[model samples]
Target chain A: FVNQHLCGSHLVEALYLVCGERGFFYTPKT
Target chain B: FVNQHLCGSHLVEALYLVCGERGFFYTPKT
Candidate 1:
């Protein structure tokens, strides 16, 4: 699995809170 | 919202500039 997914914020709503809803915060790489 | 909204992701849900995968999307801060 992704990270044992404890009881909060591991991967069910994971990816660190789904990385700010998977916008993933700052995203700039060309 | 986004019945035709734009930018900043329209009050969200399956969202984000059309949910097209942004990146900074890391996991576990490595």
Candidate 2:
């Protein structure tokens, strides 16, 4: 699993590890 | 500005850099 608390940069790979999947990541509109 | 083709993990920061802004990031429901 990817660590969400990874306070660095590698967010995609981190999320991928968290989600355990990969595809397209999007940012929810504010 | 941040690099776009980081191709590592830090995507949010990367987008924030690409967009020159920051907010929320999500994955496109596939």
Candidate 3:
């Protein structure tokens, strides 16, 4: 499921898209 | 925005909540 995001799955309101706002990007540890 | 899942707000498909599956969680620096 984590890969659901990395493997090409995935957004949100205009405000959430802000880098320092409601949303951000992340990755799982290898 | 980040607080949307925090402070007082927050889930998912039958798979996402898995500790080792589709999703996980985090917290920002204080």
Candidate 4:
């Protein structure tokens, strides 16, 4: 399984730095 | 602040499904 903790942290951090957003929100598919 | 829990969960799940990788490793900037 993916290192959910590590990668998730990097991704979120990168996105925040690039987008200036605290979160990337989306309606997940049902 | 981001809902780190929810977004992280979804991001890891999506990356796994899309990339078929167990983890995404990178060297952080020094």
Candidate 2 residue A7 Cα shift, in angstroms, is 1.7
lDDT of each: 0.35, 0.47, 0.33, 0.40
Off by over 4 Å in 4: A1-6, A21-23, A26-30, B1-30
TM-score of chain B of 3: 0.17
Show model 3 residue runs off by greater than 4 Å: A1-5, A11-30, B5-10, B13-18, B22-30
* CAPRI docking class of candidate 4: incorrect
RMSD of each: 9.5, 5.5, 10.8, 12.6
Question: If the candidates were sorted by their DockQ against the true structure, best first, what order would they fall in?
Answer: 2, 1, 3, 4
Error of 1 at A19 (Å): 7.0
lDDT of 3 by residue, B1-30 (tens): 133232322223212422435245543352
lDDT of 4 by residue, A1-30 (tens): 234453444553454444443333222221
Which portions of model 2 miss their true places by more than 4 Å? A1-5, A20-30, B1-13, B19-21
Better of 1 and 3 by DockQ: 1
Q: Whose DockQ is higher: candidate 2's or candidate 3's?
A: 2
Better of 1 and 3 by TM-score: 3
Q: Top lDDT: which candidate number?
A: 2
Q: Which ten residues in a row have the lowest lDDT in candidate 4 chain A?
A: A21-30
The TM-scores of chain A alone, one per candidate, are 0.18, 0.36, 0.19, 0.43
The TM-score, computed over Cα atoms with residue i paired to residue i, of candidate 4 is: 0.26
How much RMSD separates candidate 1 from the native structure?
A: 9.5
Q: lDDT by residue for model 3 over A1-30, one digit each (tens)?
A: 133232323222222322334355555457
Quality class of the docking in candidate 2, CAPRI style: acceptable
Decreasing lDDT order of the candidates: 2, 4, 1, 3
Superior candidate under lDDT, 3 versus 4: 4
